[PDB]
Amino acid sequence: RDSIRAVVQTLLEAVVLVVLVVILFLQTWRASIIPLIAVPVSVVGTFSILYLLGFSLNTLSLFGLVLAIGIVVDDAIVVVENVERNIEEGLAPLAAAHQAMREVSGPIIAIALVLCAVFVPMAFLSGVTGQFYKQFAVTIAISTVISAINSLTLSPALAALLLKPHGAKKDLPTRLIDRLFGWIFRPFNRFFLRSSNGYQGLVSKTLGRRGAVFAVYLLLLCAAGVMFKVVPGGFIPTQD
Amino acid sequence: MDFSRFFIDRPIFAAVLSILIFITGLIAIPLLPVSEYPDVVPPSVQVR
């Protein structure tokens, strides 16, 4: 029961937070709509396939659902970051969506395929540990596939219709957010610009001293191995 | 031939496809039961 409520609580949380984030970056009521639709119909849609493969709701499968809502959001954000960045570079919202999906569409099916390549084989592990991994893996993988289908069909279209050209006019909604929450808009948009600029400076210098980057990655992966084998192993943790 | 047109201009894709097929077969072989003949012996029940 608790797990069930978790999977719903987080979901609403995952909605709320994500919409906040988009209005902070793609500052319009237009865009905020579409992950609010995207991330529920994905996770809920998961259940359907979860039924067809004979699974059940349980602590572990619902845990996997709670983990998967995150990649679902991530797909929604990338889609509409790209579409509103198109609008920013000065394209009509429909042509904006066209260029955006030409840019990331085949990618998205590729990443769904590699995510399946890493997640589906987890369902064929051995030992009751493996039977727990199986619930986790199947739930996450089918959520990935459904979220990819959503990110390729509904989110870009809804961006095309919902969003209008930039500037246009801060409409009734947009004027409300503009006046009410312009409190803290500008300082950190411009701080974001400065932090961006610092970021390409840092990479431009690190791309010169690539040998040192290799030298730290080396022995950082050695620390990763020693830590993989000093942090306690993996079995079911006892609970109250 | 547009199928083949796509593939000849992307040879690494073609290699990847053939390798995927080969890999799935290679992991399938140890999983398969080794018998003589397919299962044709008809099952029987004894009553004593």
Binding site: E13, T59, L67, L125, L220, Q239 | -
Partner: protein, 176 residues
């Protein structure tokens, strides 16, 4: 032996043919997307970096690598995978548009900077509710949450910094 001890004593370790089969499988898919046998290593080679980072959270706490934090680790390194894949494909496509390799990687990082940070800050804002609250199963939710924090930090930092370095390094030894 009896019970789960007996099951351990008789079970095999299929992970030794599940982890590699996964890895190269992903590699194969990436090889098809990039049309390169080497460009996939820009993504793959950065994912063990986030693992340690996520794992470091447990070392921060002193917990264990139970099955829940294991699946959380795999999930966050999948997120790192997707970030690296998108920036690497953006850099390669920029190169196909006539730009040099280093400016292409630079500008690809530039374009993709915003989505990565907004996704990550959304998560790390959702992480604070995952160290307190109300409900049962507290051990599970915690041991996931602290890692999720440290691992998302690692995901962003090491994607946005290693993947451009890895991309330019890998692409310098194939153009002759």
């Amino acid at each position: 032996w009896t019970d789960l001890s007996f099951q351990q004593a008789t079970q095999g370790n299929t992970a030794l043919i599940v982890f590699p089969v996964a890895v190269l499988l992903a590699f194969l898919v990436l090889a098809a997307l990039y049309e390169s046998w080497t460009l996939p290593l820009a993504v793959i080679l950065i994912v063990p970096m986030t693992m340690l980072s996520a794992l470091f959270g447990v070392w921060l706490t002193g917990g264990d690598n139970n099955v829940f934090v294991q699946v959380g680790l795999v999930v966050l390194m999948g997120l790192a995978c997707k970030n690296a894949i998108l920036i690497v494909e953006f850099a390669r496509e920029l190169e196909i548009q006539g730009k040099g390799i280093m400016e292409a990687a630079l500008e690809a990082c530039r374009l993709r900077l915003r989505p990565i940070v907004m996704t990550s800050i959304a998560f790390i804002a959702g992480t604070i509710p995952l160290i307190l609250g109300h409900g049962a199963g507290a051990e599970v939710r915690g041991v996931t949450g602290i890692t999720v924090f440290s691992g998302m930090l690692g995901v962003t930092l090491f994607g946005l910094f290693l993947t451009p370095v890895f991309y330019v390094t890998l692409r310098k030894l194939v153009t002759r």
